[model samples]
Target: QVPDPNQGLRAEWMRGALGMLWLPERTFNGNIEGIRIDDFLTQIKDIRTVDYVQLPLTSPNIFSPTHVAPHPIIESLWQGDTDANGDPINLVAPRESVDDPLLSWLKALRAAGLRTEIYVNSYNLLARIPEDTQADYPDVSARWMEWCDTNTEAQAFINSQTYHEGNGRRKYMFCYAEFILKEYAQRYGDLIDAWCFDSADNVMEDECGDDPASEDVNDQRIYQAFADACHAGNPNAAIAFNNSVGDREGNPFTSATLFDDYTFGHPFGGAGNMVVPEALYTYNHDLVVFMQTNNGYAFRDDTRTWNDNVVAHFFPKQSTTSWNAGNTPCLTDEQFVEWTSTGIVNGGGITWGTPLVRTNLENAPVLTLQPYALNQFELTDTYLKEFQSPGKPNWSRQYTILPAIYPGQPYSHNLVEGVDFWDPEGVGITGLTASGTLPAWLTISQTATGTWTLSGTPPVSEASNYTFELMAQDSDGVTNREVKLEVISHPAGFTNPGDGTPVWFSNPMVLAKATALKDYGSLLKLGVDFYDFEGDVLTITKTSGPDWLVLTQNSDDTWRLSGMPTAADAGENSFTFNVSDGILSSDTEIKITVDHVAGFTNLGNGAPVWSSPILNLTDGKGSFAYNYTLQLGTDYYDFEGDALTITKTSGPDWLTIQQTDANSWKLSGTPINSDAGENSFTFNLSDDTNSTTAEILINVIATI
Candidate 1:
């Protein structure tokens, strides 16, 4: 029911709310200290003022949840990059071992009253590192340049930044990024309330987003495809894209794109100037403006021809903010009142960039929120909390799992109309209709008083997955909703929803989660109904079940399913029942899973996990140090909790394993030019009674 002109940003929850943008201080290697992400959010964020929280999904230096960027395609695009001494300068950390706290933080936020938003730093994957010449590994700049010079197509793609007409590299980035982004979205389900993808301003680019052709890459990539990923996860979630920066009054941001619900609102400047832009708020996109982004600075600061310098070489360098460290005075008293008042008055939201003690390399006074900053926010909450509201729009009541409906089985259900779909003005709906391709079997009807009902008996021989939409219109506008249904096959006859005389549309209460134990005796008794709408005098038989399981009915088909299982009935098991009333018959399946018990020892279990079973370590050739510290708990761990004894079973003399502590060891040495060839170190690990070996392949590439 989402109209052509997307109402995606019309989120009732985010409107008129104040949220904090987190910029956690991290090490160059992507590590955060002082407070764990899941625990410290409440400590820094004032819940009274901020009802919502927006945190990053990844960082410039690393993909925080390494799993999110596991596509080999990205590594192929930038794998050519390495330190001057042939050491690999990894922008993404090794997966699994690194904690994906972002995922955990989202869960914690959802469990509480706070709304959540995930900011995906989608572009840093290919960004040309800044070559500062001031520090070692000067911001991923040099190596990226080399890759660009070698891969002209990549450079062209970067130059245009358009999603269309690209070669393998471009296509790969598009394909895999979409896959991971969508996968994560689906994985989170309703855990995420909104998704914000940054580093993409295709609308600002030459050929995308606004008035874009169907074939345009930006449209194909983000405006549509990317937005679909977010929606695919949760139909009601809001989507946002960072519009980067611009100021109000004289020149403000005017670009628009689909799939975006609110203004990324990068209004640049001091407190007064940085406030919300009326231009954005009034526009279709709902307002969510960022006031002081400690590091969301635009490169327009240095007037050098952007494309000529390394800045131009990077997508961000050519456009918006670069990372920085600084502090600005709080908004003036007048500015604060005006900003908050105007924002709420205009149906806008506010976000202050509450920096985590200056991003990158922790320089901290306190581990949590600073008192000076906390007071202002706490006061801001006092000013707006009363006025700000969650507004409206709960296409209400979430259905985590839908009940199973059998083909030809008379079926009927009613959605208590207005309770699920209400207008913002609390007015009655003028008209109710199927918003999308409403299922053929379902009917939309309401009582004379406007209470709605959705009832339908599926036809025989029809079993399919139908996810449809519905929309109700009031004088104000239209509100849309997505509905899901699963139609399954049955052996004999069909269903008559009404059986029509008495609308006995009671749906069968099927068994959803029944389990069997491994090597343990278990029994399941299911006395649920499997109807034939016509009140069919039915017959029951096992349609499908475990090898060791069986069923029986009590007094005159009073109905009950009984079963037992042994070791053969472990893992996932499916059971189905076939019910028939001479005139109509129906079938439904119930899937169950059984648990498995185990042992852990020398001969006990699987070998100790190496986290990175195949270690790919990197270093430079010629006059550079190729050192690595392989700690016990991180690089490798024993599942049995056994004390692992590790020793270098074999390797070139250039590498040496030195014991740092009982639980840690370091691989240290220098790699000369000849060390450029492929080499490996075989480290055999013994957890007293068991042995697991890992090979560290030393990658020594020539320096640029």
Candidate 2:
């Protein structure tokens, strides 16, 4: 299904009506015909498309303060001021910056109505030269080359040039650009839906085997990996490669070597366009192509315009009628409608571009859009809505309820439930009527005139769909809407807050003598983490547990079970517990078992331990006229770090035991054929604190 931005409106982009609002690269420098960024947002805010390629990260970023350095777009955007720490205050470009107009524009485009996309060049890295240790790019401008000297990573990337170049680097070029694209995605991933590239012909030019089917970071490998880097920001984000888009007749569609998530459809071959597809290897991904080429004076110094991201230009006061060389011509509404109708029906969408003029000729140019492009966008917006998207209906009534309800996670939609059908009638809405019993924690209020916000915390045990009918009493009558909620699954239950387990929580076995120590005392503070989704204040009371164990809320408002146990309380203890968030509650049990200092060291109540996972001995009675002999300590060692004595307490008459060394005993003797069976020998082990018995079974055969 296509993404929905123009929800309440009739013209859904999916119905062959969708197209991107492309901002020309040249216009970013500011104030050509006295237009600005503020005007562009208002003009295209309502136009629905798959995405709005806001600013393609193209080569030779024409105008703007930091445009001089070919660093990833945001790297150059500094606040021009340093903090108290003397570090430059970095603004999240697009979303946040000193340019209030740009900030507002970025803010406005982030609504659910529009999916956003950004462009990145195939290989426009302005890295330094790495001829030797100290690097410098001779071809690059002095300032940008100088920029590489100060920046370690750029020089580092330049140093890596030969490593990539050895096998071929067009793929690595994409890898290199990934650093730029992923940086933007990590910050603005929520607003971003797709990533477009300028061209990959430059990549294939490298000597590396451009195989789409290989482990080498060739075409497909690097393409997918390159797309993966963007996942740091978004998981389902689309990818596109403008490798080879054949024109209208000759190579009509992109004969993609790397069939990424979307097809790069550049028929007239302007900018890289997107069509839905898989990765560059398999999917006929996103298609992006520039429309209405501009013919105007490109800027200079920090503002030399590049051809990769522009559509058209309109000079000062030049109306579309007197369109001369100074102003460029654009596609008629009929032409756009005809082209997009075929494109959208074929499951592809294109972004429409505009020529921009600087609002003012400053060190930074605030973009001002031409009127002709704006009018074209409006025309396209109205024309495209003519047909319904393939599976989707033409503009119709949307559901009043919010979209999602993920257990434990905050709902993606708003806290408000009903979409006020008529705002005028909604103002008279005073209260809400519930058909079935509503979640008690649910609260209803009209924070504003039209919308109604409902809130409550609920812990549903099963995965079930709950449809709560809510009718807003309005000036007209009952405005009924279903408030749907999906309890995806029982949210995570209570866990051991300390060690993090479900039924049982424990610490490393500690000597009862050492638990009194402060370091080990905190380890004894067993805790129960009462989990609730809405972060409600929970009331907890013990159902069944030991009196010696104490439960109290810590300073951090979490419940902790603390109280060191004595030797008598050493074995294990269990508990039944319950916690409540006023209306929603859950019951759980906890088990904890502790250890006492070994009986070998302090053997009053604890028993001495011997061996496990293996404890048997079998031997022939000395096959060559010899007798069977065995030493005890190999398996009978004590773990309590103390001296231990061992002696055979009971055995057969022929079996004789003797103390041979400090902590070991020798069981040496010859037996007859009658004693060839199993001999169950009981041994006595003594430590400083206590003594215990061990049964070590021995099988001796008749020999000597």
TM-scores for every predicted model: 0.42, 0.40
Give the best candidate by lDDT. Answer: 1
TM-score result, candidate 2:
0.40
* RMSD of each candidate relative to the true structure: 16.7, 26.8
lDDT of 1 by residue, 195-243 (tens): 6666555322332333322323344454565677677787777665665
What are the lDDT scores of the predictions, listed in order?
0.48, 0.42
How far off is residue 247 in model 1, in Å? 7.1
Q: How accurate is candidate 2 locally (lDDT)?
A: 0.42
lDDT of 2 by residue, 523-613 (tens): 1111324454444456666688666566665222234355754434555566676666677565666666645433124333434456532
